[PDB]
Design a protein around this ligand. Structure first.
Ligand SMILES: Cc1cc2nc3c(=O)[nH]c(=O)nc-3n(C[C@H](O)[C@H](O)[C@H](O)COP(=O)(O)O)c2cc1C
Ligand code: SF4
Ligand code: SF4
Ligand code: SF4
Ligand code: SF4
Ligand code: SF4
Ligand code: SF4
Ligand code: SF4
Ligand code: SF4
Ligand code: SF4
Ligand code: SF4
Ligand code: SF4
Ligand code: FES
Ligand code: FES
Ligand code: FES
Ligand SMILES: [Zn+2]
Lengths: 311, 642, 553
């Protein structure tokens, strides 16, 4: 319903289904009449602009992004809440000066700036003025105004999986690309987070992301793969680690477990060769049992199992 | 002979084999699932039921006699036919969207016409086989056990690699021991696929690789086979069309191909090289008779069957590989681009060319081979009216070719091209051609000086055995694995019967007719390629010549008791023959199994079983590290294992 | 308009809504899965992507301007189109052998053409809904969510019983609370089936029963609807025949039908009875306006929506039920055979006739009802060349009919035949037919001795609400649920758009042109039936009159 056409449809008492935009809402909106749609903060800025002079308003900000922007900062930090910063303020300043750094034991890995429709940023982009034009020419965006810091104890594949789960739930189901591709990408991400992925899965995810980005009807589907694209571009290494091993951050493996699948386990050897803890003690010829008591979740069993059954 | 069908007078024919064929000749159709291809027989479907004198019987095995009253449609026959069709469909893998026979399947059309909408019978499970190791893909879950593929592979191709196995509900057409088709003696001619009426036998589709390559930054280069242009027009329901290759070039350039060439240029180059090789062989009178190597199916068949004739095979590689090597090794340098930057796409009518492109001797030359059907799918995806497409010529310098080069697409093409090359280099006084059989032709050729030879053209594998056994009066033999040559290849549009193959040959002949230059030497680009690139014999051999190696099965296939998938181990094998079983062998096996049950936590030990090791009368035999022990017992195998 | 397509010159029309339509009109075709029926809209499939000014966009929502360059086919577009098709196929119920759209499915044809031989996308599990409670069968596992059925039911039929539910991957077209269709207000017109591009909406097949009955010892008697003979030719890809009904009679006799009758005889009977009762109503002016009851879908719609008009419905049962009752209550006696020995088969162009045959009022008269598509399926089973079949007449004494009786197959048939009966009995001075709009025709009819009265013909359910609200000056209203009448019935061959229905109407008109008898009074078998068995008014009521009751969940 944040989409303009869907917003108008919902205001009329119907399903919030967006429609193609030959008739933009500015010319024909509610019941075909011209409708002006704006955000809350734009309407808030209006009175401030009129009360002041134009130049007096432009005193703060940037030439292309004058004024300020109210942000909401979450994640582990000494102080999290609503903040207002003049356009052009770097993310490092917001995260370390206004928010006062991270709580003890928490570090910086990435920061999301626009939720599902936003993008992932790393330490390289932390020191960079916040402007619509700059972020557009930085492979990112200012976003709606929501900021969440990501620490080193959380997994970015999990972040992309979470955002795709949200998008899959929220898709209106009108056009094929968003409706089906978001679910398929979510399934691929589930496979990644469960150690069932492959390089072919990564290729499928990339091409599917491009297809969803280009062929979606409205902005929800168009920006649906944004977390996938950004997180891939910045943590291909984490993706590879999930493909050929375990979670580098343990987030996926911290609250998970390894179980020998007796259905397709014929009790061959191996397993014990790598396991330092010898948490196998299986019955030869019959399916093997992984001893959860002394399982450090190293993930070496899955790394080498010709009959892949380390679930 | 006049008969009565449903109560009306009908005149069928004077002499007929059965009622079904006679009525079909008249124009009265009886539903049936036996007549499915040229290699079809009657008696299995049981759907041709008719009523005569009260009792129902099959019309395919009923001799028509004068004054016979036959009712072809009664409620009992409707019930029986629908029951039979439901039985077929109950266990059939009903996924037509991903099937290769979608839209051209008789079973699908019957399911539509019979209004079958629910399966009253259980979709019972079978031990189905899914073989995707070769360009020919097998999926027995769509098999209706018509047996056409078996007859095609045995009676027509002479290989006999696929046969009926088991019986009853488990009846399946498969290879021996469910061996992957890639590892059998299969020549990958694709004739079983061409005759298969369902999706059980299909060609491996590689369109996704082509699309991902076109989307990439590599330079995609395509080359079309002579027989591809003579048959592609069938897929669109249109008649013959010369200039089909040029509009195909237009379409390929439209979809993003940087360069499109003609494999006929490669055919002319191969013919030139083969003509000179054959002349040297004649003047030295050695390594005769010579065999053409243009057909990869024939090459693989010779490797499997004639290891002694592998030296008699032409060293020259096929037009596809010759032109692809020329491209990758010469055109890339002429364009100043690394060989990794070029993606070579081959549009062929053959399923064995997919195998040839993946051969260890041709690695990395041809990236993907697409059959004629796959090219038709490419055209159909775009939805452009290929008929309305404006033709344009092939790209240079490998776009032009001589009539002889384009003749490669049908049986007798390479031999004719070689004859033209020889005639131009050294005239031919006269050629006398005989026709010993349907698919065998022998030519008597005399050169100007006086040295004469006999060359034979054989199309259709399986005719080679008798000719090679009884005829030794030839010096050069052209072998094409498919009837009519490449116009009837495995990758050609379906149906692929003999009438369509003859029409394709006629279309290719008409296309040849409009070619001005008649012999390879008249091809100026080809002479240029020799002049600036293949001047010396070293590069010519490294570019246009290949080697052949014998093929023999290497099956161990010994009993697996406690196998180890991989890793350093001991691989102890226990003989299980009757002689060894007579005292201790099985009991020793039990001891070892229990030993690895209590010991051998890891895959250090692989308790394995093997058949007689030709060491009988020498006590039970147990193999250790591929070593013979004799007098084996648990303690001895233990100490040897130590 | 000069535009460039794949680098060449193409001339498109000046005023075109979108580039896809313009290219289609000129001749260039672009793959898509949005244009599927008459109730189709664009923007959902997203398969019509084109390359414009370097940006990929859909051509169905693109305004064509002068001198634009569009790459219709590019490797990126190839990949996107194949990805979309694979996305559709991954969750689709890919079992075509047991599908009614097998052989006439656009998705099947694209799966064949696109070379989709595998699905790298997992077959995700959907909460699919299968329904078989009503003659109209639902199966959401084959649904591509195009929305054509919803538009047909709401905008065209005015019922709106099916609608999009849930959202996202769980989006489904269903009834309120997944209620079975037979339990909703659905009139079973089957127009959604007529418009469905997949097997998601299908007609219940009943050939198994028919074969069981034919194999048994019962006396199987068939009766063919007037509109079935004007459309069956399409299933065979052959030209319309004016003697197709006789060929069907021959074919059915071949497969073991004891008798074959023409339902146009029942049409004549019903028109005679309805004209008489309506004239009596005019005489005393009670229960007006009178509504025709030959369309079971309209009858159910009235029972659900207009409980106050039930007494205004004509008490005469529809031609199918009238002829079936006559058969099993008179013909069975004159043959000296029990009723249970007879198996009455009805060949109709309608899915609501299946529901009517199973109604409590008529239970046990018509044993089974088969649509035109089912009869075509039988003929295709036999593999008999119907074009070469020798025609023979319908069986006696219910084998002939007048032109008006055979006119029931198209909208305005019952009204025209009732006016013919009136003219025969009570002459008619002048008829002033008016056409207020496409699907409504109002005629002023003045009789020789008496006053005049307005009669209205309304084909296409959904116009009835507006007509009845606005208009309060007509005495007889004729309602057909399907546009163009029974020629556009839901059981007719697929596809059936406006042009196909008009062609069917012309075929029916040509068939009527060759009939010698003009009015039901001329039909001698009908007069014999009335003066031999239906003489007593009590018998006439208990053989030709039915009752109606309100429907309320
Ligand atoms: C999925 C989606 C969600 C959106 N949600 C919001 C929202 O919550 N608030 C908002 O102001 N604009 C939202 N938008 C942007 C609107 O679609 C549209 O751009 C809006 O009219 C812009 O308002 P503005 O001019 O005040 O920025 C959303 C867009 C999409 C595609
Ligand atoms: S992109 Fe997603 S949210 Fe937007 S219209 Fe399509 S299905 Fe609905
Ligand atoms: S390596 Fe795999 S198959 Fe072998 S015992 Fe361990 S889990 Fe089982
Ligand atoms: S995951 Fe690591 S610690 Fe756990 S059982 Fe496997 S090898 Fe041992
Ligand atoms: S062979 Fe293929 S097309 Fe034919 S019925 Fe089987 S799945 Fe369908
Ligand atoms: S491809 Fe040829 S050799 Fe191989 S199984 Fe088929 S018919 Fe036999
Ligand atoms: S694989 Fe094909 S040709 Fe062979 S028996 Fe089965 S259906 Fe017949
Ligand atoms: S004859 Fe031609 S099509 Fe047949 S296997 Fe040989 S090369 Fe291929
Ligand atoms: S709708 Fe029916 S015919 Fe079409 S693809 Fe789906 S199952 Fe096959
Ligand atoms: S049969 Fe008619 S009323 Fe019923 S759902 Fe379909 S269109 Fe609507
Ligand atoms: S049921 Fe048929 S018409 Fe309705 S949305 Fe699904 S596919 Fe379209
Ligand atoms: S108009 Fe005819 S086909 Fe349509 S619902 Fe009524 S009776 Fe059936
Ligand atoms: S045609 Fe198949 S058994 Fe007679
Ligand atoms: S049986 Fe064992 S060596 Fe022969
Ligand atoms: S035609 Fe379907 S979205 Fe354009
Ligand atoms: Zn992780």
């Amino acid at each position: 319903c944040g989409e303009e056409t869907a917003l108008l449809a919902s205001i009329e008492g119907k399903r919030g289904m967006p429609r193609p935009k030959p008739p933009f809402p500015a010319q024909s909106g509610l019941w075909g009449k011209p409708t002006l749609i704006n955000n809350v903060e734009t309407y808030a800025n209006i009175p401030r602009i009129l009360r002041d002079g134009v130049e007096n308003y432009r005193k703060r900000g940037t030439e292309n992004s004058p004024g300020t922007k109210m942000f909401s900062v979450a994640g582990p930090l000494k102080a999290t809440g609503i903040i207002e910063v003049e356009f052009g303020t770097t993310l490092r300043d917001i995260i370390y000066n206004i928010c006062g750094g991270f709580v003890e034991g928490e570090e910086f890995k990435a920061v999301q700036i626009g939720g599902p429709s936003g993008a992932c940023l790393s330490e390289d982009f932390i020191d960079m003025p916040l402007d619509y034009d700059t972020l557009k020419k930085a492979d990112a965006m200012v976003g709606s105004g929501g900021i969440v810091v990501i620490t080193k104890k959380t997994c970015m594949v999990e972040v992309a999986r979470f955002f795709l789960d949200f998008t899959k739930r929220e898709s209106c189901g009108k056009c094929v690309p968003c409706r089906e591709g978001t679910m398929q990408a979510y399934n691929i991400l589930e496979k990644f987070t469960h150690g069932k992925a492959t390089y072919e899965d990564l290729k499928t995810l990339e091409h599917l992301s491009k297809t969803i980005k280009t062929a979606s009807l409205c902005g929800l589907g168009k920006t649906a793969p944004n977390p996938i694209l950004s997180t891939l571009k910045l943590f291909r290494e984490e993706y590879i680690a999930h493909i050929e091993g375990e979670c580098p951050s343990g987030m996926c493996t911290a609250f998970k477990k390894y179980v020998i699948n007796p259905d397709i386990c014929k009790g061959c050897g191996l397993c014990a060769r790598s396991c330092p803890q010898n948490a196998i003690t299986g019955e030869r010829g019959k399916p093997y049992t992984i001893d959860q008591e002394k399982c450090v979740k190293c993930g070496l069993c899955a790394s080498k199992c010709p009959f892949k059954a380390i679930e | 002979m006049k008969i009565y069908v449903d109560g009306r007078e009908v005149i069928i024919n004077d002499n007929e084999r059965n009622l079904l064929e006679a009525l079909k000749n008249v124009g009265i159709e009886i539903p049936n699932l036996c007549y499915l291809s040229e290699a079809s027989i009657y008696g299995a479907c049981r759907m041709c039921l008719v009523e005569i004198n009260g009792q129902i019987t099959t019309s395919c095995t009923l001799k028509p006699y004068e004054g016979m009253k036959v009712k072809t449609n009664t409620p009992e026959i409707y019930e029986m036919r629908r029951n039979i069709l439901e039985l077929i469909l109950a266990t059939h893998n009903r996924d037509c969207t991903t099937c290769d026979r979608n839209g051209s399947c008789k079973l699908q059309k019957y399911a539509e016409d019979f209004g079958i909408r629910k399966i009253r019978f259980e979709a019972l499970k079978k031990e189905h086989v899914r073989d995707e190791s070769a360009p020919v893909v097998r999926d027995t879950s769509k098999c209706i056990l018509c047996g056409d593929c078996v007859r095609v592979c045995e009676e027509i191709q002479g290989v006999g690699v696929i046969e009926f196995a088991k019986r009853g509900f488990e009846s399946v057409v498969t290879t021996a021991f469910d061996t992957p088709l890639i590892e059998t003696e299969c020549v990958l001619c694709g004739q079983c696929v061409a005759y298969c009426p369902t999706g059980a036998l299909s060609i491996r589709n590689d369109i996704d690789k082509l699309i991902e390559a076109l989307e990439s930054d590599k330079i995609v280069i395509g080359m079309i086979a002579p027989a591809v242009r003579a048959a592609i027009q069938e897929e669109f329901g249109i008649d013959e069309d010369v200039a089909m290759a040029e509009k195909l070039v237009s379409f390929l350039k439209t979809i993003g191909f940087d360069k499109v060439f003609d494999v006929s240029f490669g055919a002319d180059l191969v013919a030139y090289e083969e003509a000179h090789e054959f002349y040297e062989r004649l003047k030295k009178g050695e390594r005769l008779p010579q065999f053409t190597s243009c057909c990869p199916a024939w090459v693989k068949h010779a490797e499997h069957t004639y290891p002694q004739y592998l030296q008699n095979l032409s060293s020259v590689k096929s037009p596809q590989q010759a032109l692809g090597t020329v491209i990758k090794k010469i055109y890339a340098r002429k364009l100043g681009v690394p060989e990794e930057k070029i993606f070579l796409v081959s549009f062929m009518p053959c399923t064995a060319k997919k195998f040839e492109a993946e051969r260890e001797e041709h690695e990395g030359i041809v990236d993907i081979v697409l059959t004629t059907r796959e090219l038709a799918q490419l055209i159909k995806m775009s939805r452009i009216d290929i008929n309305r497409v404006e033709p344009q010529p092939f790209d240079r310098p490998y776009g032009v070719s001589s009539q002889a080069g384009l003749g490669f697409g049908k049986a007798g093409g390479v031999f004719s091209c070689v004859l033209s090359v020889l005639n131009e280099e050294i005239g031919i006084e006269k050629v006398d051609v005989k026709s010993p059989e349907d698919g065998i032709r022998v030519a008597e050729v005399t050169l100007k000086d006086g040295t004469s030879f006999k060359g034979a053209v054989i199309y259709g594998l399986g005719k080679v055995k008798k000719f090679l056994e009884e005829r030794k009066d030839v010096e050069i033999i052209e072998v094409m694995a498919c009837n009519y040559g490449c116009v009837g290849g495995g990758g050609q549009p379906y149906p692929n019967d003999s009438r369509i193959r003859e029409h394709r040959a006629k279309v290719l002949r008409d296309t040849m007719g409009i070619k001005s230059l008649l012999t390879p030497v008249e091809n100026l680009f080809l002479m240029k390629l020799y002049e600036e690139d293949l001047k010396d014999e070293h590069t010519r051999h490294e570019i246009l010549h290949t080697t052949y190696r014998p093929r023999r099965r290497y099956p161990e296939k010994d009993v697996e008791i406690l196998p180890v998938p991989n890793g350093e181990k001991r691989t102890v094998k226990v003989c299980l023959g009757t002689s060894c079983y007579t005292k201790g062998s099985y009991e020793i096996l039990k001891k070892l199994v229990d030993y690895v049950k209590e010991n051998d936590m890891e895959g250090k030990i692989e308790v394995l079983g093997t058949f007689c090791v030709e060491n009988c009368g020498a006590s039970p035999n147990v193999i250790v590290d591929d070593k013979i022990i004799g007098g084996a017992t648990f303690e001895k195998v233990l100490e040897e294992l130590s």
